[PDB]
């Protein structure tokens, strides 16, 4: 993590960069987690034009430790290589002792305000619709577990949360939501057997938020596939719809803002689902049926219910890992996702959508 060592590695692992020396290379650490240290590494532009280096930037990733990973760290690299092969993720460039080097994407992540732009929403639906056709249009590795990660994420993170003895003010009754977790997984096992396109099991990103969508040339691209895996495709869309209400760009405590009124509008949700199905169904994109759309939208809201529990548990675990480094209040965030669960459960009950859920 010493900058000159980073320069030395890049000069010998990026093609034609060895024509430079360490004084031609710039290293800028970008925001990292506990599992990663990320650096923007570049050749100074005037040095680049003189030597005519065409790959001026790379992304330099130093691996953390597996035990701190809340995703699955043992299969993350194999999954990323597959995504890189089919040009879905940023291109893997090289590996080194303790990390890897990836293509640098020029542009900016989408903002919370970009998700109000209807043209941006259409672009996102096209990208995700085409992306979700991967498992049926190409042959993904046959040994990959096809269990929907809604089960795996919920099970894995509920276990880690129940192993805590503190749990003071995240909720006074954590086992209420631990028992709610069991209710959702049992309901979703029945609910997803109903014939619904939204219940199709495809390879999913599973962390669809605006800052994981890059806007490069007006071509939207996905990044950060660490949580990716097989899942109900409605879960990927439900995550994106939820994220229209959460702003992570706020730069003071608690470093997030929730605006439930900003939830993607119904006409926007229609426009998204129609656009999505136009790309996800190929030989007959005849899914302009409103009853198919209205049922697509209902399955999305059902999956949204469980995502609030999934990410609340994730946030509880992150809160016990961190300790005033970014000062993002993971415990307040978890409490807000738990509140989102209660409000979503009430709404679904009020419309009789989660029958036999046993409140």
Binding-site residue set: 33, 36, 61, 102-103, 105, 211-212, 224, 226
Nearest approach, Cβ of 314 to Mg ion (angstroms)?
A: 14
Looking at beta carbons only, is 24 or 224 nearer to Mg ion? Answer: 224
Q: Which residues are annotated as a binding site for ADP?
A: 33, 36, 61, 102-103, 105, 211
- Summary count for the chain: helices (H), strands (E): 11, 12
Query: Which residues have CB under 8 Å from 109's CB, separation 6+?
Result: 210, 211, 212, 213, 214, 215
Cite the beta strand spans of 256-328 per DSSP E. Answer: 257-258
* The Cα angle at residue 337 between residues 331 and 338, in degrees rounded to 5: 90
- For residue 183, what is the enclosing H or E element? helix 174-191
Q: Which residues make up the interface to Mg ion (CB under 5 A)?
A: 212, 224
Looking at beta carbons only, is 212 or 228 nearer to Mg ion? Answer: 212
Task: Report which residue's Cβ sits closest to Mg ion.
Answer: 224
Cis, peptide link before residue 254, omega less than 30° from 0: yes
Pairing outcome for strands 229-232 and 201-204: antiparallel
Q: Which residues are annotated as a binding site for Mg(2+)?
A: 212, 224, 226
Q: Which residue has the tokens 């990959």?
A: 144
- For residue 273, what is the enclosing H or E element? helix 266-280
Looking at beta carbons only, is 71 or 184 nearer to Mg ion? Answer: 71
Nearest approach, Cβ of 348 to Mg ion (angstroms)?
A: 29
Query: Which residues have CB under 8 Å from 266's CB, separation 6+?
Result: none
Nearest approach, Cβ of 287 to Mg ion (angstroms)?
A: 31
Looking at beta carbons only, is 104 or 151 nearer to Mg ion? Answer: 104
Looking at beta carbons only, is 256 or 357 nearer to Mg ion? Answer: 256
């Amino acid at each position: 993590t010493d900058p000159l060592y980073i320069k030395k590695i890049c000069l010998e692992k990026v093609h034609d960069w060895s024509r430079c020396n360490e004084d031609d290379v710039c290293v800028n650490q970008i925001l990292s987690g506990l599992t990663n240290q990320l650096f923007e590494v570049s050749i100074k532009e005037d040095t680049a034009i003189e030597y005519r280096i065409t790959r001026r930037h790379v992304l330099f990733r130093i691996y953390g430790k597996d035990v701190d990973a809340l995703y699955n760290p043992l299969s993350e690299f194999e999954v990323y290589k597959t995504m890189s092969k089919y040009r879905i993720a940023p291109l893997l460039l090289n590996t080194f002792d303790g990390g890897r080097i990836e293509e640098w994407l020029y542009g900016d992540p989408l903002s919370i305000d970009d998700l109000k732009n209807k043209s941006i929403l259409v672009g996102i639906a096209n990208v995700l619709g085409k992306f979700h056709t991967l498992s049926r249009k190409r042959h993904l590795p046959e040994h990959w577990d096809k269990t929907p990660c809604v089960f795996k994420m919920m099970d894995r993170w509920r276990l880690a949360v129940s192993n805590y003895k503190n749990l003071d003010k995240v909720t006074l009754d954590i086992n209420k939501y631990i028992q709610e977790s069991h209710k959702f997984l049992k309901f979703i096992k029945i609910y997803t057997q109903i014939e619904n396109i939204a219940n199709d099991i495809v390879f999913c990103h599973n962390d669809l938020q605006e800052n994981n969508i890059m806007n490069t040339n007006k071509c939207l691209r996905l990044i950060d596939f660490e949580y990716s895996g097989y899942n109900f495709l409605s879960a990927d869309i439900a995550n994106f719809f939820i994220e229209t209400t959460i702003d992570y760009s706020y730069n003071a405590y608690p470093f997030f803002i929730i605006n439930k009124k900003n939830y993607i509008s119904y006409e926007s949700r229609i426009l998204f689902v129609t656009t999505y199905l136009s790309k996800y169904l190929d030989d007959s994109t005849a899914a302009s049926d409103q009853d198919i759309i209205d049922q697509f939208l209902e399955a999305i809201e059902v999956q949204a219910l469980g995502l609030h529990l999934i990410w609340a548990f994730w946030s509880i675990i992150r809160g016990y890992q961190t300790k005033s480094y970014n000062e993002f209040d993971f415990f307040l965030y978890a409490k807000e996702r738990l509140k989102m669960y209660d409000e979503q459960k009430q709404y679904l009950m009020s419309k009789n959508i989660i029958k036999d859920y046993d409140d």
